[PDB]
């Protein structure tokens, strides 16, 4: 109802206003090209690895923390930036009544339109932000591995040499030694 | 010996609206309207 007293939310003529905080839901090991992962429950982005010792999932906490920070700032800015009781007239004040309706019905359309535009553009910005973050992780893993691994398409790499758990999390935390595992990769690449 | 990069999904049926597509399913969403 538009007549409110106290500290009250703003009235709009909208049926739904929903804001995105997460990602698109495309269910169904390949990488980000084929789809999303149901089995990852400890983060928004991450890694899946398989080697001789085993296989499993992980999470990239620093990218998830940055995503949480942008989402919190965006929603709080939307709440913060968009921060009567009624009048009576007699029979010989019709022009006043029409002017008062015109003011009251002209402000409400503007505020409804502003809220609906803000939601519809920020949803697009959020989804593009998530896609760019996944691309950034793929580029960092590509740049650190260079020529030791083969891209199968589909956001995945095949190691030419032998990569154990310490090797996998050395790729994961951002410190990978290029000259240490070069020669076996060169021999396995040239032998194929 | 493989490493792959992907994202996270769940069973959620929340739908949002964009400028290309309507009724887009998202993993998490927040509501700003009270009824």
């Amino acid at each position, epitope marked *: 109802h538009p007549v409110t007293i106290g500290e009250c939310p703003k009235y709009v003529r909208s049926t739904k206003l929903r804001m995105v*905080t997460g990602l698109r839901n495309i269910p169904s090991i390949a990488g980000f090209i084929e789809g999303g992962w149901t089995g990852m*429950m*400890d*983060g928004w982005y991450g890694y899946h690895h398989q080697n001789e010792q085993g296989s*499993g*999932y992980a*999470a990239d*906490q620093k990218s*998830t*923390q940055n995503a*949480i920070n942008c*989402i*919190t700032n965006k*929603v*709080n800015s939307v709440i913060e930036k968009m921060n009567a009781v009624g009048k009576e007239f007699n029979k010989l004040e019709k022009r006043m009544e029409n002017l008062n309706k015109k003011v009251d019905d002209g402000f409400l359309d503007i505020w409804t339109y502003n809220a609906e535009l803000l939601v519809l553009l920020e949803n697009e910005r959020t989804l593009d932000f998530h896609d760019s973050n996944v691309k950034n992780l793929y580029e960092k893993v590509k740049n650190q591995l260079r020529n030791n691994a083969k891209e199968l398409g589909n956001g995945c790499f095949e190691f030419y040499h032998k990569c154990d758990n310490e090797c996998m999390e050395s790729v994961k935390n951002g410190t990978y030694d290029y000259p240490k595992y070069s020669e076996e990769s060169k021999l396995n690449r040239e032998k194929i | 010996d493989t490493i792959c990069i992907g994202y996270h999904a769940n069973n959620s049926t929340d739908t949002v609206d964009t400028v290309c597509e309507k009724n887009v399913t998202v993993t*998490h969403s*927040v509501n700003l309207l009270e009824d």
Partner: antibody
Amino acid sequence: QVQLQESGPGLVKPSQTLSLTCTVSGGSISSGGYYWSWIRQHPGKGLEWIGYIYYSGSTYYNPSLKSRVTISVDTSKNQFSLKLSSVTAADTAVYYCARVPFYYDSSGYYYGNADDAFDIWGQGTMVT
Amino acid sequence: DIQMTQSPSSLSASVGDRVTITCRASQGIRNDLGWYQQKPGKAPKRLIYAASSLQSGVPSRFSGSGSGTEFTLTISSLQPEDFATYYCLQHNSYQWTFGQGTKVE
């Protein structure tokens, strides 16, 4: 509300092993990105880190005390356990089990309930 | 093997005084520090997440700042229930190291 509590014998002779179990009452072991950690304090000293484990089974242990340590998670019983050895008078101390969250989410955007963003600690057990 | 340092170990002030306390690290730790408050004979409680974000429920008299090698915690006004010991915990690497301890009186 999630509560952590500890159980252990507390009567350990030198050059023998020691086991403690931290159990969860309430919302169980949640797959949401929490360090499940053991942190110890000697009476008359400072706080010292033992080590943490994740839901999957990946474990990380203190480099100085990597002699005989074991951590283990039983999901169906909502329990996790710590195994030490050669408990001397320096090792006789107070143990705490803790649930440290991965991310800081003040407004509730990632973890949905607002109690799921709390660093809930254990009561603490004196082991001699 | 990163080590913390805190100074001074003892703080004495009356009720209503501002207390500024420092935790210093040698390495370039990017905002990975948390403040724990310990009552005597009781479990610690978290106060600040990542050196600049208060946990929900913490009163507004507690504030934190700092970046890089040094970090600071500020208390605007004391109370008789503020007798505790304060620690700084880092989580930059996989290794976790605490502070030595600062008693307030």
